[PDB]
Amino acid sequence: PEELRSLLTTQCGVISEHTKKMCTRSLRCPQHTDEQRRTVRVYFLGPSAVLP
């Protein structure tokens, strides 16, 4: 969780339909938006883990 939380800072992390898991490329990777990465943080680290 520590490094995962640190992952989402530069790494996409956007979970591809749960099964494929977090996206491993950078945030900017595809059309995976800020919301898309947000969705993951709030999922993994907490409902109130909306980091910028």
| Residue found by looking up tokens 């992952």 in the block | 7
Residue from 8, 32, 40, 41 that binds Zn ion (CB under 5 A)? Answer: 32
Q: Are 12 and 25 in contact (CB under 8 A)?
A: yes
Output the smallest distance, CB 45 to Zn ion, in A.
18
The reply on whether position 12 binds Zn ion by CB under 5 A is yes
Task: Retrieve residue 14's tokens.
Answer: 């956007």
Q: Are 51 and 43 in contact (CB under 8 A)?
A: no
The reply on whether position 8 binds Zn ion by CB under 5 A is no
The reply on whether position 37 binds Zn ion by CB under 5 A is no
Binding stretches for Zn ion (CB under 5 A):
12, 23, 25, 29-30, 32
